Amino acid sequence: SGFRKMAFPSGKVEGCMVQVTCGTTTLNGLWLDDVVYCPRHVICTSEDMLNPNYEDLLIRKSNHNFLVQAGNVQLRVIGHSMQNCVLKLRVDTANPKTPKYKFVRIQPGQTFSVLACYNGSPSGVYQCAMRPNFTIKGSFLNGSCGSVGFNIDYDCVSFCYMHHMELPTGVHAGTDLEGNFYGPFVDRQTAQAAGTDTTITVNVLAWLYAAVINGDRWFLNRFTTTLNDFNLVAMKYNYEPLTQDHVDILGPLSAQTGIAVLDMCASLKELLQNGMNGRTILGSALLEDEFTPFDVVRQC
Amino acid sequence: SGFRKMAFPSGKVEGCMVQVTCGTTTLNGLWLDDVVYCPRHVICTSEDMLNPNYEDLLIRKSNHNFLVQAGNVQLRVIGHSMQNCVLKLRVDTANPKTPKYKFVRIQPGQTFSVLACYNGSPSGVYQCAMRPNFTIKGSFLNGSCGSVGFNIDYDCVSFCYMHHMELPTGVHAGTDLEGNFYGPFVDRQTAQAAGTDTTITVNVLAWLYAAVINGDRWFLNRFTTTLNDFNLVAMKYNYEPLTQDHVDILGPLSAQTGIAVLDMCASLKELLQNGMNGRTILGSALLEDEFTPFDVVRQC
């Protein structure tokens, strides 16, 4: 028992992280087979970032303008291509530690593990969720660009995020591994800001089920509610709408605990209306929304 | 920026985890050089656990009574020894992926990363702190015994924890890697329970500094306090005493932010006395005490 925000073991990803330098900019790259993936803004100067034309900037680079370092061994770049906001650097050596992998784009509300790296060297691993406004609340310092987010399934690493930038609110924005941004963000200097966010309701319910599985039951009640009547109170507190699909996904957790989904919804409605009253749930004094139903079943 | 509960990259430890079976019990072992370390209760039946004499139980075992599996490759056990509450199984093959490592015992209040494994297979990684009452609030299911806790320094893995048992409150107890329990717990079935816990004050102050470094300043005030006057209010709320050593350790964080330690203490005193008033600090609605001063400097 116990419930922790838990990341996937990172070893399979650590063996893919390399250092990529272009000019005076150094950041992280992902080395899979004979390709290294990194943010395309590695080719940019601070002056370019104001209004870059990446097609123009890249046609002016040579293979030798990219220094790739895998620990000690330097990787010879034998070609380069742009794919949306990611650069693909073909190197003359296939990474001998390439795991079985896939590039998967995730949905707002789903979680992934982030391996934060600097100069190609992994520093830490932590779990995040893709927010409804397509930002992530990560922990990233200067030099973290190119760090990746991933899930693991059996032996297969599903890469879903590459880090590109920090927004003015301190939240983070990036792309999938095909180079396509999450959300309406761009890799240039603009006034862009995160939109208004909402709470991931299905995740809050999953986490309340985790609490029950762990013997935390004080927030339960005998009342129930309809899906409609719940969603009227959800909207009022900036919660995402709950759908029948979400109810169905919560089925297994409902079965294991014997608490119907709309019964749990009645508990959540009271928690929203009365607050927590100096009590905690699974060690937190607020309603946690960065655990998916899968995360709960996996840990419990 | 951003602040997350962040574990060390686990790859170096994943390569050391193996499966150890004795009789009908299966759990995890740590494979370093030609030795596999695991909880000695692996040799126990449920009847033995009531009042085991481990010296007697082990003299009755042979090398062939221990099945060690490193992924597929089975490890031939060529000798065994007991070291306190850990069993040491000499195997005929030295782990080719043995990292540079040390066995270090930690203090209450310090943190470490836990690699939770099952059947020798890593499942997740998360950060924990050693509580003042020598328990940890982990996330462990049946079969997690033998999972290890560690810190990483440069290239050196400092192992500090092996998981042995769950206490009735759902918290966890284990040993250092020399087999010596943290706290007054034993590896047999008794009425043992965690003692009363306290909050790690120096860590709360470190985390308030993390908040300031990240632009969260609402809890600050212009008031100050003496160490003595702080510690009178600390005791009242079940906080550990703050010492001049703790003030000195917080020096760098005080310098980076320009906020004196006893100034931060005045803010903490007001937070304890008035509560948080529906506001959050670094995304939490309670005072977080599982980040050391080192953890803050490392992430910030």
What is the DSSP track for chain B?
Answer: ------BPP-HHHHTTEEEEEETTEEEEEEEETTEEEEEGGGG--TTGGGS--HHHHHHT--GGG-EEEETTEEEPEEEEEEETTEEEEEESS--TTPPEEEE-PPPTT-EEEEEEEETTEEEEEEEEE--TTS-B-----TT-TT-EEEEEETTEEEEEEEEEEE-TTS-EEEE-TTSPBSSS--SS-S--------B-HHHHHHHHHHHHHTT--TT--S----HHHHHHHHHHTTBPPP-HHHHHHTHHHHHHHT--HHHHHHHHHHHHHH--TT--BTTBSS------HHHHHHH-
Please choose, from the candidates B295, B41, B296, B7, the residue with its C-alpha nearest in 3D space to the C-alpha of residue B139: B7
A2, A14, A141 ranked by CB distance to B11: nearest = A14
Rounded Cα distance, A63 and A80, in Å: 7
DSSP state of A41: G
Residue with tokens 């070609």: A79
A157/A166 Cα distance (integer angstroms): 25
Residue with tokens 């409804």: A132
Closest CA to A288 of A205, A186, A164, A218: A205
Q: How far apart are CA B40 and CA B53, in angstroms?
A: 11
Q: Among B41, B80, B172, B246, which one carries the catalytic annotation?
A: B41
Q: Do A124 and B214 touch (CB under 8 A)?
A: no
Would you give the DSSP letter of residue A207? Answer: H
Encoding tokens for residue B198? 């306290």
Q: Is the Cβ pair B10, A9 closer than 8 Å?
A: yes
Query: Hey, are the CB atoms on A2 and B170 less than 8 Å from each other?
Result: yes
Query: What is the CATH class of A201-300?
Result: mainly alpha
Give the residue among B86, B137, B140, B132 at the shortest CA–CA distance from B106.
B132
Please name the residue that has the structure tokens 């409605």: A269
**Paired tokens of A262:** 């709309």
CA distance A130 to A107: 7
Closest-approach residue (CA) in chain A for B210: A139
The Cα of A287 is separated from the nearest Cα of chain B by a number of Å equal to 10
Q: Which of A224, A216, A298 is nearest to A260 (CA)?
A: A224
User: Half-sphere exposure of A291 toward its Cβ, with a 13 Å CA cutoff?
Assistant: 23
**Residues 6 or more apart from B79 whose CB is under 8 A from it?**
B63, B89, B90
Report the candidate in B159, B163, B171 with the shortest Cα–Cα distance to residue B187: B163
Q: Which CATH superfamily is domain B11-91 in?
A: Trypsin-like serine proteases (2.40.10.10)
Residue B136 and residue B171 in contact, taking contact as beta carbons nearer than 8 Å: yes
Does the distance separating the beta carbons of B139 and A1 come in below 8 Å? yes
Active site residue B41: yes
Residues of chain A neighbouring B4 (CB-CB closer than 8 A): 124, 126, 128, 137-139
β-strand pairing of A121-129 with A148-153: unpaired
The residue of chain B nearest to residue A117, with distances taken between CA atoms, is B9
The nearest alpha carbon in chain B to A124 belongs to: B8
Of B7, B123, B140, nearest to A2 by CB-CB distance is B140
- For residue B53, count CB atoms less than 10 angstroms from its CB and return exposed for 0-12, middle for 13-18, buried for 19 or more: exposed
How close, in Å, is residue B259 to chain A by CA atoms?
Answer: 22
Residue partners of A156: CB distance under 8 A and separation at least 6: A99, A100, A101, A102
Could you give the CA distance from residue B222 to residue B259 in angstroms, rounded to a whole number?
10
Break-preceding residues in chain B (C–N over 2.5 Å)? none
Cβ within 8 Å, pair A172-B2:
yes
Closest CB to A5: pick one of B14, B126, B276: B126
Query: Amino acid identity, residue A242?
Result: L
B2 to A278: CB separation less than 8 angstroms, yes or no: no
Half-sphere exposure of B25 (CA within 13 A, CB side): 21
User: Using CA atoms, how far apart are residues B55 and B57, in angstroms rounded to an integer?
Assistant: 6
Closest approach of chain A CAs to the CA of B264, in angstroms? 22
The C-alpha of B215 sits at a distance from chain A's nearest C-alpha, in angstroms, of 9
The minimal CB distance from B125 to the residues A1, A6, A299 is found for A6
Q: At what angle do helices A201-213 and A261-274 cross, to 10 degrees?
A: 100
Contact A5 B286 (CB under 8 A): no
CA distances from B33 to A112, B82, B98, B101 (A): 33, 17, 6, 10
Asked whether the beta carbons of residue B139 and residue A115 sit closer than 8 angstroms, the reply is no
The technique by which this structure was obtained is X-ray
Q: Select the residue of B1, B9, B278 nearest A124 (Cβ to Cβ).
A: B9
**Residues B227/B244, Cβ–Cβ less than 8 Å:** yes
- Is residue A242 within 8 A of residue A202, CB to CB? The reply is yes
Phi, psi of A104 (to 5 degrees): -125, 135
| β-strands A100-103, A156-166 pairing | parallel
The dihedrals phi and psi of B230, each to the nearest 5 degrees, come to -65, -45
Which residues of A carry out catalysis?
41, 145
Q: How far apart are alpha carbons B185 and A217 in whole angstroms? A: 28
Backbone dihedral angles phi then psi of residue B114, each to the nearest 5 degrees: -110, 130
The whole-angstrom separation of Cα A72 and Cα A69 is: 6
CA neighbor of A148 nearest in space, from A6, A9, A14, A298: A14
- CB of B171 within 8 A of CB of B132? no
Distance CA B189, CA B175 (A): 16
How many angstroms separate the CA atoms of A289 and A109, rounded?
8
CB pairs below 8 Å between A and B: how many? 123
Task: Give B285's contacts in chain A (Cβ within 8 Å).
Answer: 276, 284-286
Q: With an 8 Å Cβ cutoff, are A10 and B15 in contact?
A: no
- Residue pair A210/A299 in contact (Cβ under 8 Å)? The answer is yes
